Each structure stands twice: as structure tokens, then as C-alpha cells.
Short mmCIF file of C-alpha atoms and ligand atoms in Angstrom, two decimals:
data_model
loop_
_atom_site.label_atom_id
_atom_site.label_comp_id
_atom_site.label_asym_id
_atom_site.label_seq_id
_atom_site.Cartn_x
_atom_site.Cartn_y
_atom_site.Cartn_z
CA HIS A 1 2.18 -5.41 18.10
CA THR A 2 2.17 -2.80 15.38
CA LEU A 3 -0.38 -0.61 13.46
CA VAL A 4 -0.39 1.51 10.26
CA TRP A 5 0.03 5.22 10.81
CA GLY A 6 -0.64 6.28 7.19
CA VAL A 7 0.74 6.06 3.68
CA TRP A 8 3.06 7.91 1.39
CA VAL A 9 2.51 8.21 -2.38
CA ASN A 10 5.55 8.68 -4.62
CA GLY A 11 7.51 9.63 -1.52
CA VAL A 12 5.02 12.18 -0.33
CA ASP A 13 3.41 11.73 3.08
CA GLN A 14 -0.43 11.68 2.85
CA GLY A 15 -0.71 12.48 6.58
CA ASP A 16 -2.10 10.59 9.63
CA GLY A 17 -4.62 8.12 8.21
CA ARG A 18 -5.72 6.46 11.45
CA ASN A 19 -9.52 6.09 11.33
CA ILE A 20 -9.44 8.46 8.33
CA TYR A 21 -8.31 6.40 5.37
CA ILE A 22 -7.09 3.41 7.36
CA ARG A 23 -9.78 1.14 8.86
CA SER A 24 -7.86 1.16 12.12
CA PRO A 25 -8.58 -1.24 15.03
CA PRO A 26 -8.52 0.31 18.53
CA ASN A 27 -5.10 -1.19 19.41
CA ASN A 28 -2.13 -3.13 18.12
CA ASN A 29 -3.25 -6.62 19.40
CA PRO A 30 -2.64 -9.42 16.94
CA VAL A 31 -5.43 -11.37 15.15
CA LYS A 32 -4.90 -15.15 15.56
CA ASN A 33 -8.16 -16.89 14.68
CA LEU A 34 -7.82 -17.94 11.02
CA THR A 35 -11.54 -18.48 10.62
CA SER A 36 -12.63 -15.12 12.11
CA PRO A 37 -14.06 -12.18 10.12
CA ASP A 38 -11.29 -10.23 11.85
CA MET A 39 -8.91 -11.82 9.31
CA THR A 40 -10.35 -9.56 6.57
CA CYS A 41 -9.49 -6.06 7.87
CA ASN A 42 -8.96 -6.54 11.57
CA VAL A 43 -11.47 -6.00 14.43
CA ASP A 44 -13.12 -2.69 13.40
CA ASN A 45 -13.83 -3.09 9.71
CA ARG A 46 -16.04 -0.21 8.57
CA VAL A 47 -15.90 2.49 5.92
CA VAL A 48 -13.76 5.43 6.99
CA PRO A 49 -14.36 8.87 5.52
CA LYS A 50 -11.36 9.32 3.16
CA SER A 51 -9.75 7.30 0.34
CA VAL A 52 -6.15 8.12 -0.81
CA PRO A 53 -5.91 9.12 -4.53
CA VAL A 54 -3.30 7.32 -6.59
CA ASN A 55 -2.59 6.42 -10.28
CA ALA A 56 -1.24 3.20 -11.76
CA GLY A 57 2.56 3.17 -11.53
CA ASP A 58 2.66 5.21 -8.39
CA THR A 59 4.57 3.96 -5.33
CA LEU A 60 2.22 3.41 -2.32
CA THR A 61 4.08 3.15 0.95
CA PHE A 62 2.54 1.83 4.21
CA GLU A 63 4.06 3.18 7.36
CA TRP A 64 3.83 1.05 10.51
CA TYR A 65 4.48 1.85 14.17
CA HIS A 66 4.31 0.34 17.61
CA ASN A 67 3.25 3.00 20.16
CA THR A 68 4.26 6.28 18.54
CA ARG A 69 5.29 7.25 14.99
CA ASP A 70 8.75 6.15 13.91
CA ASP A 71 9.50 4.31 17.16
CA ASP A 72 10.72 0.69 17.36
CA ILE A 73 7.94 -0.22 14.90
CA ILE A 74 7.38 -3.85 16.02
CA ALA A 75 9.15 -5.96 18.62
CA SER A 76 12.30 -7.63 17.25
CA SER A 77 11.09 -11.02 18.47
CA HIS A 78 8.25 -10.93 15.80
CA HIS A 79 10.23 -12.47 12.94
CA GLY A 80 8.03 -13.20 9.96
CA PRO A 81 6.81 -12.38 6.44
CA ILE A 82 5.02 -9.43 4.97
CA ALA A 83 2.34 -9.40 2.24
CA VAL A 84 0.01 -6.89 0.53
CA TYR A 85 -3.19 -7.76 -1.14
CA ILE A 86 -5.78 -5.77 -3.11
CA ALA A 87 -9.49 -6.09 -3.51
CA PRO A 88 -12.22 -3.81 -4.90
CA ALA A 89 -13.91 -1.74 -2.26
CA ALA A 90 -17.42 -2.85 -3.31
CA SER A 91 -16.55 -6.37 -1.94
CA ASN A 92 -15.95 -5.00 1.59
CA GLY A 93 -13.30 -7.72 1.59
CA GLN A 94 -15.85 -10.54 1.37
CA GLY A 95 -15.59 -13.36 -1.13
CA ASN A 96 -12.81 -14.57 -3.32
CA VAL A 97 -11.48 -11.11 -3.98
CA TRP A 98 -8.00 -10.68 -2.51
CA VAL A 99 -5.14 -10.56 -4.96
CA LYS A 100 -1.57 -10.65 -3.81
CA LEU A 101 0.68 -7.80 -4.94
CA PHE A 102 3.73 -8.32 -2.70
CA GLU A 103 5.46 -11.07 -0.67
CA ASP A 104 8.72 -10.93 1.30
CA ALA A 105 9.60 -13.68 3.87
CA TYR A 106 13.28 -14.47 4.46
CA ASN A 107 16.21 -12.93 2.58
CA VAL A 108 19.12 -15.41 2.50
CA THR A 109 21.75 -12.87 1.40
CA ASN A 110 21.08 -10.56 4.23
CA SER A 111 19.99 -13.31 6.65
CA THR A 112 16.96 -11.20 7.58
CA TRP A 113 13.24 -11.71 7.79
CA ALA A 114 10.82 -9.17 6.24
CA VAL A 115 9.96 -7.93 9.78
CA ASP A 116 13.62 -7.32 10.57
CA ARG A 117 13.98 -5.13 7.50
CA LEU A 118 10.70 -3.34 8.26
CA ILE A 119 12.18 -2.13 11.51
CA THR A 120 15.31 -0.95 9.64
CA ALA A 121 13.02 0.78 7.13
CA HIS A 122 11.29 2.81 9.96
CA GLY A 123 8.08 0.89 9.33
CA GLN A 124 7.91 1.54 5.60
CA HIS A 125 7.20 -0.89 2.81
CA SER A 126 5.68 -0.28 -0.63
CA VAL A 127 3.91 -1.57 -3.66
CA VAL A 128 3.60 -0.08 -7.16
CA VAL A 129 -0.01 0.54 -7.97
CA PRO A 130 -1.13 -1.87 -10.75
CA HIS A 131 -2.93 -1.08 -14.04
CA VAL A 132 -6.34 -2.27 -12.79
CA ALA A 133 -9.75 -0.61 -13.35
CA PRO A 134 -10.06 2.87 -12.00
CA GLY A 135 -12.17 2.91 -8.86
CA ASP A 136 -12.10 2.41 -5.07
CA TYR A 137 -9.98 -0.37 -3.51
CA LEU A 138 -8.87 -1.85 -0.25
CA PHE A 139 -5.16 -2.55 0.18
CA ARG A 140 -4.62 -5.17 2.92
CA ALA A 141 -1.15 -5.11 4.43
CA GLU A 142 -0.32 -8.20 6.59
CA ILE A 143 2.55 -8.91 8.83
CA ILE A 144 2.78 -12.50 10.24
CA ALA A 145 4.82 -12.72 13.45
CA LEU A 146 5.99 -16.37 13.91
CA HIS A 147 7.51 -16.36 17.47
CA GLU A 148 4.67 -18.62 18.76
CA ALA A 149 3.79 -20.26 15.46
CA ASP A 150 5.15 -23.70 16.65
CA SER A 151 1.62 -24.09 17.94
CA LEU A 152 -1.75 -23.71 16.18
CA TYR A 153 -4.16 -21.22 17.62
CA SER A 154 -7.02 -23.64 16.84
CA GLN A 155 -5.36 -26.23 19.13
CA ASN A 156 -3.84 -23.83 21.71
CA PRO A 157 -5.41 -20.36 21.79
CA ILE A 158 -2.66 -18.93 23.91
CA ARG A 159 -0.09 -19.42 21.09
CA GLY A 160 -0.14 -19.44 17.27
CA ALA A 161 0.85 -17.28 14.35
CA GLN A 162 0.04 -13.63 14.86
CA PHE A 163 -1.53 -11.41 12.14
CA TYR A 164 -1.14 -7.67 12.04
CA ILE A 165 -3.65 -6.68 9.35
CA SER A 166 -4.39 -3.21 8.14
CA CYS A 167 -6.70 -2.11 5.37
CA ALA A 168 -6.19 1.20 3.54
CA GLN A 169 -8.84 2.81 1.40
CA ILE A 170 -7.19 3.71 -1.98
CA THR A 171 -8.78 5.33 -4.99
CA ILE A 172 -7.12 4.53 -8.34
CA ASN A 173 -7.81 7.43 -10.64
CA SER A 174 -5.64 7.27 -13.77
CA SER A 175 -5.18 3.75 -15.11
CA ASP A 176 -5.65 2.17 -18.55
CA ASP A 177 -6.99 -1.09 -17.05
CA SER A 178 -4.52 -3.07 -19.09
CA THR A 179 -4.08 -5.67 -16.31
CA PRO A 180 -7.63 -6.06 -15.02
CA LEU A 181 -7.81 -7.66 -11.60
CA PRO A 182 -7.99 -11.51 -11.61
CA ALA A 183 -9.79 -13.86 -9.23
CA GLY A 184 -8.59 -13.60 -5.65
CA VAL A 185 -8.64 -15.54 -2.32
CA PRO A 186 -10.97 -15.09 0.65
CA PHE A 187 -9.88 -13.80 4.08
CA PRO A 188 -10.92 -15.48 6.28
CA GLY A 189 -10.46 -18.73 4.35
CA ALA A 190 -7.20 -18.66 2.46
CA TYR A 191 -5.06 -19.52 5.49
CA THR A 192 -5.82 -22.87 7.24
CA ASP A 193 -3.96 -24.96 9.86
CA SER A 194 -2.32 -26.97 7.02
CA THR A 195 -1.25 -23.97 4.96
CA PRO A 196 2.49 -23.74 4.40
CA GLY A 197 3.95 -21.05 6.65
CA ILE A 198 1.24 -20.87 9.29
CA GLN A 199 2.75 -23.55 11.64
CA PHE A 200 6.51 -23.20 11.69
CA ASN A 201 9.26 -23.31 14.28
CA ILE A 202 11.67 -20.49 13.75
CA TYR A 203 13.87 -21.67 16.60
CA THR A 204 14.82 -25.04 15.07
CA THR A 205 13.97 -24.92 11.37
CA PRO A 206 16.31 -22.96 9.11
CA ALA A 207 14.62 -19.81 7.83
CA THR A 208 15.88 -20.68 4.31
CA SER A 209 13.43 -23.50 4.65
CA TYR A 210 10.45 -21.20 5.40
CA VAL A 211 7.68 -21.12 2.82
CA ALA A 212 5.25 -18.18 3.08
CA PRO A 213 1.53 -18.93 2.79
CA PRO A 214 0.12 -18.89 -0.75
CA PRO A 215 -1.37 -17.38 -2.88
CA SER A 216 1.59 -16.45 -5.06
CA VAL A 217 2.14 -12.85 -6.14
CA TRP A 218 -0.11 -11.97 -9.14
CA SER A 219 1.94 -11.71 -12.42
CA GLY A 220 0.30 -8.30 -12.98
CA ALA A 221 1.81 -6.90 -9.79
CA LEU A 222 4.27 -4.09 -10.64
CA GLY A 223 6.79 -4.12 -7.87
CA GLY A 224 7.38 -3.56 -4.22
CA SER A 225 9.95 -3.28 -1.45
CA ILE A 226 10.74 -2.90 2.24
CA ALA A 227 12.68 0.37 2.45
CA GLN A 228 12.30 3.82 3.89
CA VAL A 229 10.99 6.33 1.27
CA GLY A 230 10.54 9.21 3.60
CA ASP A 231 11.72 10.79 6.83
CA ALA A 232 8.90 11.16 9.32
CA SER A 233 11.14 13.04 11.75
CA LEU A 234 11.16 16.01 9.30
CA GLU A 235 7.31 16.06 9.31
O1 LIG B 1 4.08 -13.06 25.97
C1 LIG B 1 5.54 -13.13 25.94
C2 LIG B 1 5.98 -12.50 24.63
O2 LIG B 1 5.70 -11.09 24.71
C3 LIG B 1 6.04 -10.33 23.59
O3 LIG B 1 5.79 -9.00 23.99
C4 LIG B 1 4.50 -8.47 23.80
C5 LIG B 1 3.76 -8.50 25.11
O4 LIG B 1 3.37 -9.86 25.38
C6 LIG B 1 2.46 -7.76 24.95
O5 LIG B 1 1.65 -7.84 26.08
C7 LIG B 1 2.73 -6.31 24.53
O6 LIG B 1 1.46 -5.65 24.38
C8 LIG B 1 1.57 -4.22 24.66
C9 LIG B 1 1.96 -3.46 23.36
O7 LIG B 1 3.31 -3.64 22.91
C10 LIG B 1 1.79 -1.97 23.59
O8 LIG B 1 1.99 -1.30 22.36
C11 LIG B 1 0.41 -1.64 24.13
O9 LIG B 1 0.28 -0.27 24.49
O10 LIG B 1 0.19 -2.34 25.33
C12 LIG B 1 0.21 -3.74 25.19
C13 LIG B 1 -0.15 -4.31 26.56
O11 LIG B 1 -1.57 -4.17 26.76
O12 LIG B 1 3.39 -6.37 23.26
C14 LIG B 1 4.65 -7.03 23.27
C15 LIG B 1 5.28 -6.84 21.89
O13 LIG B 1 5.44 -5.46 21.71
C16 LIG B 1 7.49 -10.45 23.27
O14 LIG B 1 7.82 -9.69 22.08
C17 LIG B 1 7.77 -11.94 23.02
O15 LIG B 1 9.15 -12.15 22.70
C18 LIG B 1 7.43 -12.73 24.28
O16 LIG B 1 7.64 -14.09 24.04
C1 NAG B 2 -12.82 -18.24 15.80
O1 NAG B 2 -13.77 -17.65 14.88
C2 NAG B 2 -14.85 -18.50 14.60
C3 NAG B 2 -15.57 -17.82 13.43
O2 NAG B 2 -16.00 -16.55 13.86
C4 NAG B 2 -15.66 -18.53 15.92
O3 NAG B 2 -16.87 -19.15 15.79
C5 NAG B 2 -14.81 -19.19 16.99
O4 NAG B 2 -15.52 -19.16 18.21
C6 NAG B 2 -13.49 -18.39 17.14
N1 NAG B 2 -12.60 -19.03 18.12
C7 NAG B 2 -12.38 -18.49 19.33
C8 NAG B 2 -11.47 -19.29 20.22
O5 NAG B 2 -12.87 -17.41 19.72
CL1 CL B 3 3.18 -11.46 21.84
CL1 CL B 4 -8.01 -13.56 17.22
CL1 CL B 5 15.58 1.12 4.63
CL1 CL B 6 -1.94 3.39 -16.89
CL1 CL B 7 -12.11 -19.86 7.17
CL1 CL B 8 8.72 -0.13 -4.30
CU1 CU B 9 3.23 -8.27 19.29
#
């Protein structure tokens, strides 16, 4: 159970975005139904009044939290991967529009899942804004918590993989459109019961064995990381 508080751009806090430039749901409950429209941008998908201005090559940092800003972020039990996708705003997230910019699952060196390092990063993880067409976009940040992913929600609705999905409204201003956005995947639709990484037992399978759900990261993606860029406690 975790939500996005806001974003930073090039290490500068853009301020509380909840229901402002983040299409925030009313609480931190997970989405579990892979076929539901809630898979797109969570349970309250509507246009919010602001869109964060960025340029290609900028660092866009999502900041997550549990109950209050810069708290425990997400429960430590929620081991799992993190992804970020992009789609044009005009889609409203519908169709085959979502392009993957970032994926982190398990890091063998450090023996840590993406979620583990998200906590250590005070909720912060980033992508570099790609050289796509200037305009309005949705950035869909997705945490998958696997602590009940031994089961399938479709089979047992009290268990299953848990999705913490947040959509940020981002306006790309300066960009040469040298890497125009390719075809994407639909949400709901891309993840099914047979998809690698949706049904997995973290308690008996080695994490080195884990395969995150496709699609793969777009070759035009410019970078990303799970790491603190800024100190909220000084805000
Ligand atoms: O169900 C057993 C599993 O519980 C996990 O903890 C979650 C609780 O089940 C869940 O009810 C609680 O929801 C809280 C939420 O954290 C809080 O922010 C909000 O204000 O109130 C909700 C209650 O309405 O969330 C926790 C995770 O934070 C354990 O993590 C898991 O190991 C255990 O198996
Ligand atoms: C999952 O979502 C589908 C598509 O909206 C819906 O028809 C179905 O009833 C949902 N499942 C549950 C258990 O609510
Ligand atoms: Cl839970
Ligand atoms: Cl659900
Ligand atoms: Cl860090
Ligand atoms: Cl550019
Ligand atoms: Cl579907
Ligand atoms: Cl980065
Ligand atoms: Cu939770």
C-alpha cells in the first residue's frame, strides 16, 4: 500500500501533486484485477488540472509514500518489480499506447528487489525524459507487490499480484522528436494470467529466477534508476 506524492524534475521538487498533476485514487489499496479498467491509471482516472513541464533529457523522479510523506514508503513484505510507461495524453490510456521506459526487478549483486531499494531511496525512482514529440503525456508508474502472487486473482480473489499504479500528467516542451514514440501495449490487456512474472512464488523460487512481465524497455528510453534525488525533510 503506497501512493505517489509528487515528482521532482532535475532534482527540483515540483510540490504536492496529489489530485493536481497526479490522477490520484482515494487510497493506497492495490489493484488486482488484470482485466479491469482500473489497470490503466487506478480507480479514479480523470483529467486533473495541472501537467508538469519537462524537456527531453530531464530527470523525472516519482516520489512514493505509504501514509505520510517520506515515511516507510511501502511495507517491506511487498517485494517486487517496478516499471514506468508512457503514453500520449490524447489516448486517455486506452488502446495499444503504453511504451515501457524503465524496468527493475531483482538485483543479484545487491540481493534486493526494486521495492526494497525504493524504500531505501525514500520512495524515489526516475526516468530520463525521451526525445518524443512535444505535447501532453501520461507517465504510468507501476509497482508489483508479489507477496501473494503464488495465487491468481482470477482464481482466488483474496490473493494475487498487487498493482500500485499511478499516472502523472507530464508536458514535454522542448524535444527534437528524434525518437518518436513507437507502438505500445494496452492496460488492461498486456498482463494476463500466463504472463511471465504475474504468478510467482517468492518464498520458494530463487529471485534470480524471476522474469518481470513484458514488454521490454523501449530502445529509445534514455535511462532511469531507483535512488533518492532529493531530501523531502528539508522541504
Ligand atoms: O493481509 C495480510 C498481509 O497484510 C499486509 O499488510 C497490509 C494490510 O493487510 C492492509 O490492510 C493495510 O492497509 C492499510 C494501509 O497500510 C494504510 O495505509 C491505510 O491507511 O489503511 C489500510 C487499512 O484500511 O496495508 C498493509 C500493508 O501496508 C502485510 O504487509 C503482509 O505481509 C500480510 O501478509
Ligand atoms: C474484473 O474486471 C472485469 C472487467 O471489468 C469485470 O467484469 C469482473 O467482474 C472483475 N472481477 C471482479 C472479481 O470484480
Ligand atoms: Cl496486503
Ligand atoms: Cl482490483
Ligand atoms: Cl538511494
Ligand atoms: Cl531534444
Ligand atoms: Cl484484459
Ligand atoms: Cl535516472
Ligand atoms: Cu500493501
